[PDB]
Design a protein around this ligand. Structure first.
Ligand code: 3IL
Ligand code: 3IL
Ligand code: 4Z9
Ligand code: 4Z9
Lengths: 157, 156, 155, 155, 157, 156
């Protein structure tokens, strides 16, 4: 019945993302993780790799599924008969560009956005910073699921 | 059966609050609006008056109910078999509210979902509406119709 | 003989910008909208100027001009020393703050910031272009003229 | 016939306030400093007005008046519809933002914010009073007149 | 030789404070914890209680000592032949009022302020919020040192 | 023997940077200014030129030395037997810098101490000073005297 979409590029998914997935899956009947792909810029991981890494670390969430898309998020959401987005937030600054997008999305499509504070322990990991730290050899094994860490090191080598 | 609690003093409820209630009621199977009773600061409206104003404003939300509460919010939430709070936000306070959300998650496993106010209601607050009205300012576009009527009576 | 300059790329001008123009025009005798030439945008400078002129026809004390280089030189060369800029958030206040203090330091030009109308809090030229590109309806966020012009650039 | 109102409690007026007054006076034909009567402060309204008048003698187009109630009524009753307020941080921008939007909504009064001079970024009436109370030297942060007056209230 | 002062009301000290003490003690030759007392408002704990709770949870920091004071912090600092303050920070908002005070303190006394980000795990505890939560019965045992938690519950009962 | 590293690109060093260097040198037994070499973005001055400008500006700081570095900052710090970074801050970025500080603490046990810029230098940055100077703006009050001389030469 109820449902929410958790969007991102997830390149790769982090433990901060997984925390948000788990919290959304606990509060909505269904959750769709939307892996949003830019057709004009390849990330580090292909779409299939991104989805596989997410599925492997969400196997214990029976009401969660993972799908890719592109274009307007609100179309992805509405085409699935839903009208809620759930996004994780770390800071007041995150709240301002995300605020702009949430109000635009409500304006153009009537889709609501719910924000959740990520857990303190994952508050400083981002996909981008984990990739940058790993590139120059820093240890990020505690910030990423097992489904990700060594695949990341493999990409870098 | 999903559910969330929308907490506040609501003294009085504003259209900003109502917008949050509507969005919560659209996304959860049940919503409870929790009206704080505070033994120290007694504001402008009694708890009963505040509950009545909220019920009038939410008459079209069948899955939303209004109740008073006291003490620790997460106790109120867990006592009703729920473990989610929904709160409206205007600015990045994402900061004091963030502290509270992480504290509430830590002590009781209760999650908090924040939603941005509609742009049109982003500058209204109960306190500022009362202050403006006290001096003859017109805040009728920022409050439910019934609240505005009741507010003018308390000022006379 | 008061006056202020309202700067931007305006690619395209939005109703948020127009709101700021109207407020500046209501409080200063003379307003100049300063359109940056910075050549990777959607509209040419001439088109951007046209769209602003079209949308500001009811503001007799406002004119529109293009410029390059330091904004403070554009302002001072026209005998003014005030900039009027619209602001949506505290984050915008901090980087605009740095610029405002730099501009005051190097040229004695003051910067006045005004809050967006609540209804345009979330519109920007770039987000409007992005949403429209993927088929979203931004007609309520742009001057009627601009909206038709945008459709023409995408189709 | 342009004009703006600069509001505050000014208890006492600081060099940060004076900087904002001077900037408002340079860009508007008429400036009114609006001193709130809100009776728990250090100086009486008359003393606060005196200190501002003393510090603004070189600003011929500025006057100082006391008021109560809604600031927008003070502004409108004098035929104006602009407020000029100084800002130090993004945090100040957000609660002042709420007020500015409320004031625009209820009375059509616009609010222009200006960044403090860097040198007065950290001075406020309350922090100056607090520091002086415990013996700290705030003489570089207040008009010469005000500083002597403050010493007299503490001793 | 080198030295810093860690100020606060510490009513009571939290694990967030202790983290900051430990980090200052690791980077400066001596650290003084300055327990600042308002003679015009009693807190929950008396000065002696505050100091005892701090000493008991800093026994393994040999270069740290604890002293109370009042009035201007910069006088406390300079009277001890020091000119640095170390303070913990959680948010961008914390950085703004603290910024104002740091620049005032440099202006009036030449004293520098160094800020450190508290550990993620303690980022949401404050003395005030711990007291408020404990007052209404919430479990804050993991946010306070052993020297504090039951003494706090005792004050409340 | 206490110590800290002050990292940056310093392209060129500003009076804001120098103020941070001076405060660090006053509070730690040794300070190392770490000048980043970045293979991708080659800015206005070479690493050697940047080191020379910093050494000129810090001639009166005997316990401060200047070195170039590459890659992970915490490796640079630990390789020199230190575990503290000192960085200057202008605004609440306390946010991206906070993320980085917590990351650096997590991966290598290196702490970060932030200090507020002097009010007078709070709006200067290397990037904005270059941009202003490129168009004939006068930034001589915001840079060390020698930097200003060298900067005018690169623009000609
Ligand atoms: O947003 C707010 O103001 C709420 O936290 C009020 C609130 C705090 N504790 C409560 C217990 C029962 C009902 C409401 C409350
Ligand atoms: O503040 C900054 O820009 C620093 O992080 C630069 C920086 C990042 N990694 C480094 C390695 C060696 C020397 C400097 C660096
Ligand atoms: O706000 C902005 O986007 C920029 O200030 C625009 C700008 C910079 N320099 C200029 C010179 C002339 C005209 C406009 C400009
Ligand atoms: O900025 C402030 O401190 C307040 O806006 C001051 C203020 C509120 N209402 C007023 C009416 C008349 C004169 C000043 C005021």
């Amino acid at each position: 019945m109820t449902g929410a979409v958790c969007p991102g590029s997830f390149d790769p998914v982090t433990l901060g993302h997984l925390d948000v997935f788990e919290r959304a899956a606990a509060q909505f009947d269904e959750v769709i993780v939307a892996v949003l792909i830019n057709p004009n810029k390849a990330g580090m991981f292909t779409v299939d790799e991104r989805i596989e890494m997410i599925r492997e670390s969400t196997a214990d969430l029976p009401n969660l599924r993972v799908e890719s898309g592109q274009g307007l998020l609100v179309d992805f959401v509405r085409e699935r008969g839903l009208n809620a987005i759930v996004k994780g937030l770390r800071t007041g600054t995150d709240f301002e560009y995300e605020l702009q997008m949430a109000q635009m999305n409500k304006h153009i499509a009537g889709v609501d956005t719910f924000f959740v504070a990520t857990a303190p322990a994952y508050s400083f990991v981002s996909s981008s910073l984990a990739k940058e730290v790993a590139t120059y050899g820093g240890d990020v094994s505690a910030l990423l699921p097992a489904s990700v860490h060594q695949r990341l090191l493999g990409k870098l080598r």
